[PDB]
Ligand binder design. Structure first.
Ligand SMILES: N#C/C=C/c1cc(Br)cc(Oc2ccc(Cl)cc2OCCn2ccc(=O)[nH]c2=O)c1
Lengths: 549, 416
């Protein structure tokens, strides 16, 4: 009989809000008896108290039959009360990551039954919890109750129970500092490096302690032999991995299917090196609907194929050893795609992960590498409470010549060069100064913003002039294609001069890759060249210029 | 400790609840530091552990004091400030002296410890709640709320106002030539005295406060009479190419928006015809005349630019390279209240984030001196990067508001 001698947490309603009033007279003459029995058995345990109709409040109560029919369960709808009660501290927004756990010699898992019913509820609040089982009929008043403990489904049950459990544990943790206890919901995960016998002992002591506090634990041993299928994980004594991930096979795919697909793939990516979600996620730009069918692309099909190839052979993670160094390694994959592995040991990976940029049109490799490093820094701080040693496929000359002249401020930790091609490099560098005697193209271009027709053209110093007609183009794409034009018609050394701040914007940032085909072409031309100098002049200011209307 | 009168009643702006801001993840080192610090502050009854019934949270960080090995705890009260202090700005507000920026020297003192003497209004305490985060969500964080006046909350200097005025009163009357302005936890003391003499007066004030029970844990020395809006400089060169004149005309075109008078019309005629970029060009009479128009009109600042206390202060920083940075503080575009530059060393220590942090702190301090308020920054850094590494170099008790700008095209060229 789990009653409690515990300090209650005071609870108030949201200011200006009274208690919930909702009523159900009819039906369910079968289940009403189950409600009678359940409530009588719940009264003897002091969990609920029958109340005189002094004009208190009311909420619905339904008795639902459990499957595999054996016993009945009682469900209450507290949504109204939950709507009117105050706000509490978030119990958990996070989850602990197995890669951060410390390897232990013994791990016991206890689950406390009637967790919420074992914690008393604040007195002044108890009137708001009043629910009333209806009576069959004839206009005979239903039997009124109210909760003496944390009601199930109530807004403040998880937080308050977490607190109560924490305090209940507080003395024991001090009495036995050599073992470690984790709280997750009902579950207590205990572990120790001491003798198996000592372990069994300590566990039993804690069990009887909780039982003295009114918290029941599994009576036959501790049960729960490893694995240990927990929160979508397989926890082995020396190893950790992910519960099996089933990738289906379909003729037609919908938004829901692609979303669950990229979900399972994301969940896989932590322990499985090589996972690529890019094209599949690009298919999710079709978010307009849910059940809408989305035809797969070739790239997406190959992505899912490669993922299937990766998943077919199981691989495992290793636990954390604070007495060992923390290392992180980043390797390049594909278009906008990067992968990393965090490990303390050469063949033993703590975890893996991926990084890709969903926002912005044009970005280079050094930048993406930096961003990956950042993501891993954050992730490692959250998981292990520190920042690892990075080992990167980039020369120091490269990055030094990068973060020096990059307009944005950036910082990266101690990192060691590793040679495992492709190595991140600068495919081209714009000149900071013009080129002597080399042909200087003056470029311009425009478009009618209605007819959507445009022209891109150049006039050089040597006298060369050209105008290329362009259909279905806007004013920006023209002034980019003017730079393109001047690139393809020029020798290995060229001074291009434009009035477009947009084009200068794109070029000066020196992207190695973009999703714009024109910008990709311009990039290819820039790589193929030797010395390119882009220069800017104010539009319509009457310098040498190109005037073609 | 005992309260002279009952705790000062502190309410919240009507229709506004307490800050729910989440706690940033921390490194094990900083967590342990905050755990020692908070254990000690709890031992001193300065703070108290709280229950699940306190939904409010404001973040905590671990930053060092000056150069020392002592870990200090910094609370970001910016949200709680926005909520409770906007009408604690009017009600208890400390007016800003306009003479602090005109004095030849200014020193800053950290008086914040004083706030630990005064108890905090009970009803309000729930709003000061914070959390020390566990590594890897292995445990829920440790939750305290402030029993006394917390540092960084701007309600604290407002409540302690009267007491500070008391303690300062004799020193003030004995020294009529000294300007004293409290912003947050800092005392800003200006004077026209010689440096040594200024330091004498400062040490005097320090010891005075010290024997009144106010502890104040070479130093921070400001010289606001060197502060002025920095002009635009057009290059000085012996031989000029076509490109140099292009950049000249461009920078002049952008600058012509700030100052109307200047015109480049005579400098364009030397670029007449389609020139090669590296073609060397001489300097004619008219173009040089318009350069004489160029340099003398850019050394005298704009008119009609006035500070609006209602509008926020906006600070933009651009990285010019080699440790150098530049900045502009202004309310409305094309109008500039303050303009400047900053130079760190050539390295052997510093990195981008460090230099930017020191820069932001400098600029904020200047703004505190001049307008009595902190500017809102547009930062040339990736959000996650700053949010990770900013606490490292942060030596100050306050924090400014900030956002992150991704797109300067040409401006790095124009402000150098
Ligand atoms: N349901 C279910 C189980 C879920 C569960 C969830 C968490 Br969070 C922790 C946990 O066990 C541990 C508890 C405390 C400590 Cl200090 C380490 C642990 O693992 C250390 C590594 N380890 C993990 C399991 C095992 O058998 N042996 C072992 O050394 C179990």
């Amino acid at each position: 009989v789990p009653i409690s001698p515990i300090e209650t947490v005071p609870v108030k309603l949201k200011p200006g809000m009274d208690g919930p009033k909702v009523k159900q007279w009819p039906l369910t003459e079968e289940k009403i008896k189950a409600l009678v029995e359940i409530c009588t058995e719940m009264e003897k345990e002091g969990k609920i108290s029958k109340i005189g109709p002094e004009n208190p409040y009311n909420t619905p109560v339904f008795a639902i039959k459990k499957k595999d029919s054996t016993k009945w369960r009682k469900l209450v709808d507290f949504r109204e009360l939950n709507k009117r009660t105050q706000d509490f501290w978030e119990v958990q927004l996070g989850i602990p990551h197995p890669a951060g756990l410390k390897k232990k010699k013994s791990v016991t898992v206890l689950d406390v039954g009637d967790a919420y019913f074992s914690v008393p509820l604040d007195e002044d609040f108890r009137k708001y919890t009043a629910f009333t089982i209806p009576s069959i009929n004839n206009e005979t008043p239903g039997i009124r109750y109210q909760y003496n403990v944390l009601p199930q489904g109530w807004k403040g049950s998880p937080a308050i129970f977490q607190s109560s459990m924490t305090k209940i544990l507080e003395p024991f943790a001090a009495q036995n500092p050599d073992i470690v206890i984790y709280q997750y919901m009902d579950d207590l995960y205990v572990g120790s490096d001491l003798e198996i016998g000592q372990h069994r002992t300590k566990i039993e002591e804690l069990r009887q302690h909780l039982l003295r506090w009114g918290l029941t634990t599994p009576d036959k041993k501790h049960q729960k032999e490893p694995p240990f299928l927990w929160m979508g994980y397989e926890l082995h004594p020396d190893k950790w991995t992910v519960q099996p991930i089933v990738l289906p096979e379909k003729d037609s795919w919908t938004v829901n299917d692609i979303q669950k697909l990229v979900g399972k793939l994301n969940w896989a990516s932590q322990i499985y090196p090589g996972i690529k979600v890019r094209q599949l996620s690009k298919l999710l730009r079709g978010t307009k609907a849910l059940t809408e069918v989305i035809p797969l692309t070739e790239e997406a099909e190959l992505e899912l194929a490669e993922n299937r190839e990766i998943l077919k052979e199981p691989v495992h993670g290793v636990y954390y050893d604070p007495s060992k160094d923390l290392i992180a390694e980043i390797q390049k994959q594909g278009q906008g795609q990067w992968t990393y592995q965090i490990y303390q040991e050469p063949f033993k990976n703590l975890k893996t992960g991926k990084y890709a940029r969903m926002r912005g049109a044009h970005t280079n490799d050094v930048k993406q590498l930096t961003e990956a490093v950042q993501k891993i820094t954050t992730e490692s701080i959250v998981i292990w409470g520190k920042t690892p040693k990075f080992k990167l496929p980039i020369q120091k000359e490269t990055w030094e010549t990068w973060w020096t002249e990059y307009w944005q401020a950036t910082w990266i930790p101690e990192w060691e060069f590793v040679n495992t091609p492709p190595l991140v490099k600068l495919w081209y560098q714009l000149e900071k100064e013009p080129i002597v005697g080399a042909e200087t193209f003056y470029v311009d271009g425009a478009a009618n913003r209605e007819t959507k027709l445009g022209k891109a053209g150049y006039v050089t110093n040597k006298g060369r002039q050209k105008v290329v007609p362009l259909t279905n183009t806007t004013n920006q794409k023209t002034e980019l294609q003017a730079i393109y034009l001047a690139l393809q018609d020029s020798g290995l050394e060229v001074n291009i001069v434009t009035d477009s701040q947009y084009a200068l914007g794109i070029i000066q940032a020196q992207p190695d890759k973009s999703e714009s085909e024109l910008v990709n072409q311009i990039i290819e031309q820039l790589i193929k060249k030797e010395k390119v100098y882009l220069a800017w002049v104010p539009a319509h200011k009457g310098i040498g210029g190109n005037e073609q209307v | 400790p005992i309260s002279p009168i009952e705790t000062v009643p502190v309410k919240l702006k009507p229709g506004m609840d307490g800050p729910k801001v989440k706690q940033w993840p921390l490194t094990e080192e900083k967590i342990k530091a905050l755990v020692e610090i908070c254990t000690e502050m709890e031992k001193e009854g300065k703070i108290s552990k709280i229950g699940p019934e306190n939904p409010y949270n404001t973040p905590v960080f671990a930053i060092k004091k000056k150069d020392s090995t002592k870990w200090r705890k910094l609370v970001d009260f910016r949200e709680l400030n926005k909520r409770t202090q906007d009408f604690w700005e009017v009600q208890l507000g400390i007016p800003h002296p306009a003479g602090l920026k005109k004095k030849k020297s200014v020193t800053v003192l950290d008086v914040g410890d004083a706030y630990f003497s005064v108890p905090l209004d009970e009803d309000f305490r729930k709003y000061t709640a914070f959390t020390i985060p566990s590594i890897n969500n292995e445990t829920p964080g440790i939750r305290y709320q402030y029993n006394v006046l917390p540092q960084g909350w701007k309600g604290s200097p407002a409540i302690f106002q009267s007491s500070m005025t008391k303690i300062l009163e004799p020193f003030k009357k004995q020294n009529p030539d000294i300007v004293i302005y409290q912003y947050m936890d800092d005392l800003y003391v200006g004077s026209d005295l010689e440096i040594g003499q200024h330091r004498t007066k400062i040490e005097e004030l320090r010891q005075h406060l010290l024997r009144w029970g106010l502890t104040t844990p070479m130093g921070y020395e400001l010289h606001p009479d060197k502060w002025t809006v920095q002009p635009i400089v057009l290059p000085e060169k012996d031989s000029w190419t076509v490109n140099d004149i292009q950049k000249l005309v461009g920078k002049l075109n952008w600058a012509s928006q700030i100052y109307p008078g200047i015109k480049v019309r005579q400098l364009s005629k030397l670029l007449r015809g389609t020139k090669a970029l590296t073609e060397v060009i001489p300097l004619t009479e008219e173009a040089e005349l318009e350069l004489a128009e160029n340099r003398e009109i850019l050394k005298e600042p704009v008119h009609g630019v006035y500070y609006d206390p209602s509008k926020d202060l906006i600070a933009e920083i651009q990285k010019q390279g080699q440790g150098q940075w530049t900045y502009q503080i202004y309310q409305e575009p094309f109008k500039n209240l303050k303009t400047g530059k900053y130079a760190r060393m050539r390295g052997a220590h510093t990195n981008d984030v460090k230099q930017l942090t020191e820069a932001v702190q400098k600029i904020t301090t200047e703004s505190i001196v001049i307008w009595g308020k902190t500017p809102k920054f547009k930062l040339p850094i990736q959000k996650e990067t700053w949010e990770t590494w900013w606490t490292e170099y942060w030596q100050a008790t306050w924090i400014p508001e900030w956002e992150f700008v991704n797109t300067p095209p040409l401006v790095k060229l124009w402000y150098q």
